[PDB]
Design a protein around this ligand. Structure first.
Ligand SMILES: CCCCCCCCCCCCCCCCCC(=O)OC[C@H](COP(=O)(O)OC[C@H](N)C(=O)O)OC(=O)CCCCCCCCCCCCCCCCC
Ligand SMILES: CCCCCCCCCCCCCCCCCC(=O)OC[C@H](COP(=O)(O)OC[C@H](N)C(=O)O)OC(=O)CCCCCCCCCCCCCCCCC
Ligand SMILES: CCCCCCCCCCCCCCCCCC(=O)OC[C@H](COP(=O)(O)OC[C@H](N)C(=O)O)OC(=O)CCCCCCCCCCCCCCCCC
Ligand SMILES: CCCCCCCC/C=C\CCCCCCCC(=O)O[C@@H](COC(=O)CCCCCCCCCCCCCCC)COP(=O)([O-])OCC[N+](C)(C)C
Ligand SMILES: CCCCCCCC/C=C\CCCCCCCC(=O)O[C@@H](COC(=O)CCCCCCCCCCCCCCC)COP(=O)([O-])OCC[N+](C)(C)C
Ligand SMILES: CCCCCCCC/C=C\CCCCCCCC(=O)O[C@@H](COC(=O)CCCCCCCCCCCCCCC)COP(=O)([O-])OCC[N+](C)(C)C
Ligand SMILES: CCCCCCCCCCCCCCCCCCCC(=O)O[C@H](COC(=O)CCCCCCCCCCCCCC)COP(=O)(O)OCCN
Ligand SMILES: CCCCCCCCCCCCCCCCCCCC(=O)O[C@H](COC(=O)CCCCCCCCCCCCCC)COP(=O)(O)OCCN
Ligand SMILES: CCCCCCCCCCCCCCCCCCCC(=O)O[C@H](COC(=O)CCCCCCCCCCCCCC)COP(=O)(O)OCCN
Ligand SMILES: CCCCCCCCCCCCCCCCCCCC(=O)O[C@H](COC(=O)CCCCCCCCCCCCCC)COP(=O)(O)OCCN
Ligand SMILES: Nc1ncnc2c1ncn2[C@@H]1O[C@H](COP(=O)(O)OP(=O)(O)OP(=O)(O)O)[C@@H](O)[C@H]1O
Ligand SMILES: Nc1ncnc2c1ncn2[C@@H]1O[C@H](COP(=O)(O)OP(=O)(O)OP(=O)(O)O)[C@@H](O)[C@H]1O
Ligand SMILES: Nc1ncnc2c1ncn2[C@@H]1O[C@H](COP(=O)(O)OP(=O)(O)OP(=O)(O)O)[C@@H](O)[C@H]1O
Ligand SMILES: *[C@@H]1O[C@H](CO)[C@@H](O[C@@H]2O[C@H](CO)[C@@H](O)[C@H](O)[C@H]2NC(C)=O)[C@H](O)[C@H]1NC(C)=O
Ligand SMILES: [K+]
Lengths: 483, 364, 38, 145, 335
């Protein structure tokens, strides 16, 4: 009939034994902090703080980041995911009932919108340096923590254990709220903007001070670093005025050729000083490249492994959806208990959402890997060209060192060898990431089709050697054609 | 996928026609000279490395009082709606916790019971009722079908909170509306500046004349005229100031800056010895470091708010050797101003030399 | 990945050869030791 | 090859479950805009890369045929502080090209994921053999690729 | 020893000490004026306390009038008798305690009027209390709205934003010594009708014996049309040229360390946003005048725009200058 909250059963509103011992009241108390946050933060965002109290014609050009920035974004996205899961479970459970139990999923939907608004509020605070305001966020997190904690202990008093899905989801939410509160506390500690007498002295990065730096990848928030959103303007400026050399303005001081040349020179000097004391040891460029461009390759491999792991969500979700849609649900008897932690993954509508999220996460991870390794390869190429030039300047004109074909060797070394080395540094992660993916694919094939999958894998795997042979013959033909 | 990984064919791509013949290097793509004050009367520099003084919570309020009428209404409505909702949630929670929702459900199942002796707030039984009660307490309607009893003191605490918060919000919103009502004539600026500034001859000496006029019907009290020249100058001891502003007097029979502006006026500065433009000739006024700023200030008699209107002229805008056509011409029995002829200029004959040279051989 | 493995391996071989050439070029006679004393 | 695979895939998606193609109209719209803007910027970006590599090679050749003259005039730093500028222009051309490619790949991957969702949800609530659910899933997944 | 007495500190705020003033009487208007200008942290507190105190005071009054009448007894015996023997005898219906009196006072003064505690027409004293409560509530409500209106009105104005360089210079500019300092603005708006005035505070003696403790002498600032009005968008260098009548005529370079000087700078104007006239002050003493320096340039052209660089605002580089008093450079022209 009517649209209640704790359901249509009278005895579900009893508050005899205690308010906490009534689960619906704990759900309402969980619903409260989200609406408090929304009502505090919607007016603040709508009003703005655009009071022109200072020269902002070159203050809008620069911005800043607070201490915990990437960790905050990663935690808020994880919390968004956990809330999506809670919404889904609540809806599924409610559809197995008589009435509409709004206390299963309305708190989760409010939490979803509140967390989204929390990250919007944090960004709009950070872009215009204003740490005092984020005190509001502080309060939010603390309150949320408390409320969620209560839910947990009341589950724990019934001994629900980790075998029940809701207990696991609530525990994850508790620890994520705790981590976010810790992030806020550390921000207060490092910036000293409330309870201290002397705040900090912070200035934007030196690169945004210059008006010619138009490559804004290192200077933007993690959700724009991950979608290349900052690029939009330039690309949409391809209609009004065709791109010139001026639009791609300049390089940030961290990616210029001089800095990377300094790094590579110092690494090579460390290697050579170590080797000179050694009696009969030859120089090595390989180890000079490592220890100077080795961290970003590890980061690329990490993103690559995460993308490769998430990639398998296609076959698994497909199998689940198909093997669920086979049998009509008329036969099954009524079950009023909360859905099992395995019956959550057994659904036909949960798995579609899981596949969707898995795809949009795998693609982002893959593109992050590509971009990081590309940028590393380009910086290494710039350093190599600088080094080769500085060696060219210090050369002898004697005919016992020079030769009838020496400018040709130099021309090749600048026009071909550098490009080949760079395009290897791009595809370096595929060396130790492809085997993992192929092995895991064969494992899944076996565990899905028996020992016929071994025959199928044996057939397909031969694709690489055949392509190698064809490639070699093709290269020889191309060489003759070029001659 | 992997478009041009194979990278052999290069280093011998012959020079293009524009490369070898040197037709491309004819760039002729110089950036325009940097202005100091725009033509739209807005100064456009770029101050940098200014120590950020943070923000203050007062800035949010300062913004709130100064907003468009299409945002004042929205914030008005949102504030009131949010307040009613927040306190509705509080009242519904109080009703839940005290055991009033359950009591009403059980005594309305058999509604003949009709017992409401022990309830925090009478006749509140769902969330719709809580919302209606919060509306009747914040707006002070008070129908009285949902009373506040003397039973539970948490309810009284929430009632006190709600009355005070409602009063605070009401006072703030009336203050905002009244402030926007007091600033009702404060719209904009309507001082019209000629586009090209001629350099004519008047009474045997050159000049630098432009035209200025009004659009608002309200008079301007104690109008004032300032004219400056912006250029980089060096002292004989050799200190270079990139942007030096030098003040140039304005012609006036009693040596004053007071202009009485009802009909449009011509503002002339005569090129005497100390004038910055003493040593400039018509052939020099093609490429030249020269920006002349004009600043007119006054008070509009209606609002009594000081107004300052600025403009700037560069070497391209100046029309050496012209003058201004007479905008004003008498009608049948009343003076008339044809504002369509405001910036229109006529051409006349003037010496091509500089005043630097026009008074060393005067008989020319 | 099976298709791209061949290109990755070929690029590895060419990169090895390229680093060899780079070491050979970096070991060459140079002019100095008279301008080094200022 | 790519366009025929995409066309056949969306055709079978629509035939297996018609409700998808009513959702086709928005997605296609989005695609068109992408296929516009990239293609306009990409050319320009390429027109810089191939243009900023020709001088960078030329410079080297000069400083290889006239090293004695340069070391005579002692004009070495004047040439190094130029080589650095050349290589930085070239590198920024490459970086902006790669960033444009990554922008395109992210956008089209999100479009593919939206296609996957709007096909899987239509197929989950449908009346057809499990074969025409599996076909829909597999082809809407390959479209992403 | 003790720092020498100043006239105006490095942030204005004249450091004098007026004493023996014939003190006047303290008026309630001072209390009201203090009330109308306050900090929000205190405005909110006084706002809340006024209403709480008024509700409580009239709650006490209503409880007393329910006590003096036979009201509390009637409503306490009705429960025993189980019959409404107290419907019409009551001074104010259904007020039977102090909590109910407090609720009734809230309803009457905030004008809710739920109507469970109605105003009967028997006891005139209650009608008197009701009229009194309505008038008092109206007065308090009007006062508090007036305070909030004043806050909103004077909300826009904020703190000072004129930046002055820490210490001055004495250079040679166009063949004469000039005392120079630099003034800049951090505000976004335009100081309409600005103006600059310079004074020298010094103890002077007259030939007739009239000794003035701190005499203020007016210094003609140097402008090419002999006026004060300064237009301030990029930081300016205010200058003064030391001529035959400037008090800085006879002060040499060596003995600038120990000389009773103080240069006060007063800069006035009218802001554009709110039209509230402002005045900013500063002062320089002997220790903070650097002979023979000059300010470095600050504005560079980025080929699209000019770009002031405020990091170098107070920088000042050393140059050459005749190391002698301004009298000797013309009475002894050869130098
Ligand atoms: C009950 C629990 C209560 C807990 C008790 C208290 C615990 C205390 C811990 C909290 C400490 C918070 C301090 C923050 C650390 C800041 C360190 C420092 O800032 O450098 C961190 C570095 C530097 O980048 P940045 O400073 O953040 O600023 C960004 C800017 N662009 C810049 O790099 O200059 O930035 C980085 O280096 C990025 C680091 C990323 C680390 C995240 C790892 C990923 C793990 C994935 C987890 C996913 C979430 C969970 C998933 C669950 C799914 C259901
Ligand atoms: C979580 C919650 C979600 C909330 C969702 C959003 C809720 C929104 C609900 C209402 C939205 C209304 C927005 C409509 C926008 C139309 C604005 C319209 O009034 O413009 C008319 C103007 C707007 O001037 P401006 O552009 O702001 O510029 C400021 C100034 N002119 C300047 O240039 O500097 O404005 C004015 O000029 C003044 C208008 C005054 C208003 C009229 C009141 C009438 C009183 C007078 C009595 C007349 C009789 C009325 C009776 C009507 C019968 C019903
Ligand atoms: C759901 C909401 C939706 C509706 C919202 C929309 C907007 C409507 C409401 C508008 C809110 C009112 C605007 C307040 C403006 C903020 C001003 C802010 O500056 O003051 C907050 C204070 C700062 O103190 P301050 O430095 O002295 O400020 C004055 C400043 N120096 C000046 O220039 O002059 O910061 C501090 O430093 C904190 C110190 C204490 C301040 C507050 C004390 C609280 C006292 C009592 C408040 C509670 C009221 C209820 C009590 C009930 C009792 C039963
Ligand atoms: C300018 C109009 C602007 C506001 C218009 C919305 C008001 C409608 C209120 C309403 O629908 O009743 C709702 C009040 O609960 C609320 O909905 C609270 C209303 C606050 C609106 C805030 C929007 C942001 C009640 O919800 P219901 O849907 O009526 O369900 C009742 C049970 N039933 C199913 C038996 C009927
Ligand atoms: C944005 C518009 C605001 C609209 C919110 C109200 C939604 C409709 C009302 C509704 O759902 O009824 C329910 C409120 O359920 C809730 O408690 C929802 C509270 C959410 C507040 C949203 C803030 C934003 C009613 O729940 P109940 O009070 O438990 O009903 C008593 C049982 N009985 C009716 C059988 C007697
Ligand atoms: C900030 C909110 C304040 C509101 C507090 C309400 C309760 C006050 C304390 C109290 O117990 O009330 C009691 C007295 O109470 C008094 O006598 C206090 C009178 C002076 C108080 C002055 C400072 C406040 C009221 O009880 P009663 O008047 O004796 O009622 C008699 C009838 N009955 C016995 C059936 C109940
Ligand atoms: C979920 C997260 C939603 C967050 C709320 C919206 C704010 C996000 C944008 C931040 C912001 O300040 O933009 C406002 C959007 O205004 C607008 O243009 C939209 C409102 C227009 C109503 C008609 C401008 O705010 P403003 O226009 O009110 O400020 C004008 C003078 N500061
Ligand atoms: C992820 C972001 C996009 C959300 C995708 C889901 C779109 C709507 C699907 C909802 C749906 O039909 O299935 C429900 C579960 O889905 C869910 O639980 C999805 C919840 C997503 C909320 C964010 C239970 O639908 P049903 O089993 O009650 O019956 C209905 C058909 N038979
Ligand atoms: C993971 C998969 C996420 C899929 C949706 C992502 C859409 C990207 C929106 C977020 C975004 O672009 O970043 C903001 C852009 O703001 C905006 O322009 C508004 C964003 C509108 C969509 C939300 C931050 O902006 P910023 O960091 O680049 O600005 C810094 C200097 N102001
Ligand atoms: C969950 C599983 C993966 C978690 C990886 C956390 C990555 C968080 C950011 C890491 C980061 O920014 O550091 C980079 C290296 O990353 C790394 O090296 C991550 C190592 C892989 C962990 C598994 C740059 O490295 P760096 O600049 O900090 O290196 C100089 C040392 N001071
Ligand atoms: N009749 C008019 N009404 C309003 N504004 C005018 C009028 N005449 C000139 N102006 C103002 O003069 C400024 C310069 O305009 P513009 O350069 O187009 O022509 P002009 O030199 O003013 O005269 P004309 O329009 O006759 O050529 C503009 O900002 C415009 O607002
Ligand atoms: N200490 C003070 N505080 C305020 N006002 C003063 C003070 N001393 C003098 N005045 C003002 O100065 C004026 C002095 O004139 P008055 O008629 O008082 O002469 P007086 O009493 O001889 O002065 P004094 O006693 O100061 O020598 C009066 O108008 C008075 O208002
Ligand atoms: N870049 C800037 N941004 C904001 N305010 C500034 C800036 N530079 C100077 N100021 C202000 O100008 C005043 C004069 O500073 P000046 O440059 O003469 O000495 P300083 O070395 O900056 O001294 P301090 O380090 O104490 O500011 C200082 O009080 C400071 O508040
Ligand atoms: C509504 O009330 C309770 C929920 O706690 C459900 O359990 C019944 O409650 C009564 C006590 O009033 C018990 O004696 C019964 O054994 C319970 N009946 C069961 C488990 O079937 C109750 O089922 C709920 N639903 C109704 C009454 O329809
Ligand atoms: K009533």
């Amino acid at each position: 009939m009517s649209l209640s909250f704790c359901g249509n059963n009278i005895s579900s509103y009893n508050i005899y034994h205690g308010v906490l011992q009534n689960p619906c009241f704990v759900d309402a108390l969980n619903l409260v902090p989200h609406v408090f946050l929304l009502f505090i933060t919607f007016p603040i965002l709508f009003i703005g703080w655009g009071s022109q109290s200072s020269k902002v014609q070159i203050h809008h050009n620069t911005w800043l980041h607070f201490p915990g920035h990437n960790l905050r974004w990663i935690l808020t996205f994880a919390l968004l995911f956990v809330h999506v899961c809670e919404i889904a479970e609540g809806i599924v459970s409610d559809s197995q009932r008589a009435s509409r139990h709004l206390h299963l999923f309305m708190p989760a939907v409010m939490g979803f919108v509140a967390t989204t608004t929390s990250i919007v509020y944090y960004h709009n605070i950070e872009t215009s340096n204003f740490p005092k305001l984020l005190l509001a966020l502080f309060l939010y997190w603390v309150m949320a923590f408390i409320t969620k904690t209560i839910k947990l202990v009341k589950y724990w008093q019934l001994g629900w254990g980790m075998s029940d899905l809701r207990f696991c989801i609530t525990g994850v939410m508790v620890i994520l709220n705790g981590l976010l509160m810790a992030v806020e506390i550390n921000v207060i500690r490092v910036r000293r903007y409330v309870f201290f007498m002397n705040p900090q002295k912070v200035k934007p990065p030196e690169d945004l001070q210059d008006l010619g730096v138009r490559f804004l990848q290192p200077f933007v928030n993690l959700l724009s670093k991950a979608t290349y959103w900052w690029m939009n303007t330039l690309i949409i400026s391809a209609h009004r005025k065709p791109i010139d050399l001026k639009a791609i303005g300049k390089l940030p001081i961290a990616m210029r050729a001089v800095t990377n040349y300094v790094c590579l020179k110092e690494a090579y000097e460390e290697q050579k000083k170590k080797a000179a004391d050694h009696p009969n040891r030859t120089p090595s460029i390989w180890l000079a490249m490592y220890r100077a461009f080795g961290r970003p390759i590890l980061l690329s491999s990490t993103f690559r492994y995460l993308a490769d792991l998430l990639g398998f969500a296609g076959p698994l979700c497909i199998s689940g959806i198909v093997q669920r849609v086979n049998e009509p649900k008329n036969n099954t008897t009524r079950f009023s208990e909360t859905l099992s932690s395995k019956e959550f993954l057994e659904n036909a509508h949960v798995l579609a959402v899981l596949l969707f999220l898995a795809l949009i996460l795998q693609r982002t991870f893959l593109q992050a890997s590509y971009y990081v390794t590309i940028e590393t390869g380009i910086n290494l190429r710039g350093a190599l060209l600088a080094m080769i030039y500085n060696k060219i300047l210090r050369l002898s004109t004697s005919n016992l060192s020079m030769g009838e074909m020496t400018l040709g060797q130099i021309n090749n070394l600048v026009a071909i060898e550098t490009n080949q080395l760079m395009w290897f540094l791009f595809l370096c992660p595929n060396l130790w990431a492809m085997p993992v993916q192929i092995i895991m694919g064969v494992i899944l094939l076996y565990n899905l089709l028996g020992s016929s999958a071994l025959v199928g894998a044996a057939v397909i795997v031969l694709l690489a050697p055949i392509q190698y042979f064809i490639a070699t013959k093709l290269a020889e033909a191309q060489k003759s054609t070029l001659d | 996928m992997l478009a041009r990984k194979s990278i052999i064919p290069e280093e011998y791509v012959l020079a293009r026609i524009a490369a070898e013949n040197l037709r491309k290097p004819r760039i002729r793509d110089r950036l325009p000279k940097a202005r100091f004050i725009a033509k739209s009367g807005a100064c456009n520099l770029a101050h940098k490395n200014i120590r950020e003084q943070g923000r203050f919570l007062q800035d949010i309020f300062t913004t709130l009082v100064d907003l468009k009428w299409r945002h004042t209404l929205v914030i008005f409505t949102m504030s009131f709606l949010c307040s009613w909702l927040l306190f509705a949630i509080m009242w519904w929670l109080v009703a839940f916790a005290h055991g009033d929702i359950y009591a009403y459900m059980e005594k309305g199942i058999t509604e003949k019971s009709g017992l409401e002796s022990a309830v925090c707030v009478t006749n509140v039984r769902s969330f719709t009722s809580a919302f209606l009660f919060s509306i009747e307490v914040q707006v002070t309607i008070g129908f009285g079908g949902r009373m506040m009893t003397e039973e539970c003191p948490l309810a009284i605490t929430v009632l006190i909170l709600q009355n005070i918060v409602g009063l605070i919000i009401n006072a703030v919103m009336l203050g905002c509306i009244f402030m926007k009502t007091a600033q009702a004539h404060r719209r904009a600026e309507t001082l019209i500046f000629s586009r090209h500034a001629v350099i004519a001859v008047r009474n045997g000496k050159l000049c630098f004349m432009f035209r200025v006029g009004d659009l608002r019907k309200s008079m301007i009290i104690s109008a004032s005229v300032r004219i400056q020249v912006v250029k980089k100058t060096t002292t004989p001891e050799g200190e270079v100031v990139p942007i030096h502003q030098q003040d140039i007097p304005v012609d006036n029979p009693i040596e004053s800056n007071n202009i009485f502006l009802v009909a449009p006026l011509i503002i002339c500065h005569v090129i005497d010895k100390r004038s910055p433009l003493y040593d400039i000739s018509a052939t020099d006024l093609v490429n030249q470091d020269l920006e002349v700023i004009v600043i007119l200030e006054g008070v509009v008699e209606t609002t009594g708010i000081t107004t300052q209107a600025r403009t700037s002229y560069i070497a391209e805008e100046i029309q050496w050797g012209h003058r201004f056509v007479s905008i004003v011409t008498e009608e049948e029995g009343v003076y008339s101003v044809d504002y369509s002829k405001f910036g229109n200029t006529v051409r006349v004959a003037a010496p091509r030399c500089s005043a630097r040279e026009l008074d060393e051989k005067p008989s020319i | 990945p099976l298709f791209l493995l061949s290109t990755v391996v070929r690029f590895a071989v060419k990169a090895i050869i390229s680093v060899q050439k780079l070491n050979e070029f970096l070991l060459s006679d140079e002019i100095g030791e008279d301008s080094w004393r200022t | 090859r790519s366009t025929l695979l995409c066309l056949s895939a969306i055709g079978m998606i629509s035939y297996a479950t018609p409700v998808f193609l009513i959702a086709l109209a928005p997605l296609g719209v989005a695609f068109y805009f992408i296929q516009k803007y990239f293609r306009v910027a990409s050319k320009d970006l390429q027109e810089l890369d191939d243009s900023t590599q020709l001088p960078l090679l030329c410079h080297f050749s000069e400083t290889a045929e006239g090293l004695t003259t340069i070391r005579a005039f002692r004009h070495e730093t004047r040439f190094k502080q130029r080589m650095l500028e050349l290589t930085d222009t070239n590198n920024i051309a490459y970086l902006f090209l790669s960033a444009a490619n990554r922008w395109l790949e992210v956008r089209t991957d999100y479009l593919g994921a939206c296609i996957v969702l709007t096909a899987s949800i239509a197929s989950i609530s449908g009346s057809s053999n499990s074969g025409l659910v599996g076909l829909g899933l597999l082809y809407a997944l390959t479209i992403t690729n």
